[PDB]
Design a protein around this ligand. Structure first.
Ligand SMILES: CCCCCCO[C@@H]1O[C@H](CO)[C@H](O)C[C@H]1O[C@@H]1O[C@@H](C)[C@@H](O)[C@@H](O)[C@@H]1O
Ligand SMILES: [Hg+2]
Ligand SMILES: [Hg+2]
Ligand SMILES: [Hg+2]
Ligand SMILES: [Hg+2]
Length: 263
């Protein structure tokens, strides 16, 4: 909307690829976010001028509430630093949510377990698992109407190898000749409108399957993949955004490990 100010930065090189080791754009022209593909300074400017607010949702039920402290603490250090953030912790133990110190412009809501609420409080929703920790930058470069994340264990696999639901009976069914990538169920987001549409489509699909006495192989993640196949995400995050160093190590292709599993 508003004009950007004068900025000094390296001139993009038209005859010099960002990365020569990875695909940085999908066949439907959505960028694939890898370190080295973006100037965070330009992006921060663009989003700050819109006074962008990001909601981060996590479900911490039962034993998982024990991961909240490390989750929230690292988020404070690496998640959307400089922008307005609203954490939404859905838990069955409200009193167990640790008292974490938050930077200015950042708040936390504990909801014990209305969509409209999100519509008026945030511009984007980022949905992740609680048993994780941020180890590096995760900022506005991910914001877009709809985004999915490349699963750290299948990014180099062929589609036929993907663990999609393969039963024609299930709503999440995806034949062997279809599929772009295998997205993670633990890190997706976008505008509130798009995220609500995705979860609404998923909930309905899961119900239909339940009524037919069937449950997709990888449950929610299976339905997410089916939705993202039929509604292409406007951005795809690389495995940098959700990795497991203990299980997968640190490939050269990953210049940064931003969000990881807690061993
Ligand atoms: C190519 C061989 C597979 C290695 C990774 C297995 O990852 C698991 O994949 C299934 C889908 O088939 C599901 O997404 C769970 C996922 O496991 C989790 O994520 C991985 C990256 C590790 O962090 C595990 O400890 C998790 O349980
Ligand atoms: Hg580049
Ligand atoms: Hg969400
Ligand atoms: Hg669902
Ligand atoms: Hg889903």
């Amino acid at each position: 909307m508003v004009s950007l100010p004068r900025m000094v930065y390296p001139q993009p090189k038209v005859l010099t690829p960002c990365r020569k080791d990875v695909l940085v754009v999908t066949p439907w022209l959505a960028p694939i976010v890898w370190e080295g593909t973006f100037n965070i300074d330009i992006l921060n400017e663009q989003f700050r001028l819109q006074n962008t607010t990001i909601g981060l949702t996590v479900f911490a039920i039962k034993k998982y509430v024990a991961f909240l402290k490390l989750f929230l603490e690292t988020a404070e250090k690496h998640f959307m630093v400089g922008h307005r953030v609203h954490y939404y912790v859905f838990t069955d133990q409200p009193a167990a949510v640790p008292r974490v110190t938050l930077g200015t412009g950042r708040q936390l809501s504990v909801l014990e377990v209305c969509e409209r609420r999100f519509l008026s409080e945030v511009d984007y929703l980022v949905c992740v698992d609680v048993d994780m920790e941020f180890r590096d930058h995760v900022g506005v470069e991910i914001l877009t109407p709809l985004f999915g994340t490349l699963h750290p264990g299948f990014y180099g696999s062929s589609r036929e190898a993907f663990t999609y639901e393969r039963r024609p009976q299930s709503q999440a069914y995806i034949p062997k000749d279809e599929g772009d990538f295998y997205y993670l169920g633990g890190f997706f987001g976008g505008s509130v409108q798009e995220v609500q549409r995705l979860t609404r489509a998923c909930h309905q699909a899961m119900m239909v399957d339940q009524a037919n006495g069937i449950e997709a192989v990888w449950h929610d993640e299976s339905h997410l993949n089916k939705y993202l196949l039929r509604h292409k995400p406007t951005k795809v995050l690389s495995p940098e955004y959700l990795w497991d160093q203990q299980l997968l190590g640190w490939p050269a292709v990953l210049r940064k490990l931003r969000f990881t599993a807690v061993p």
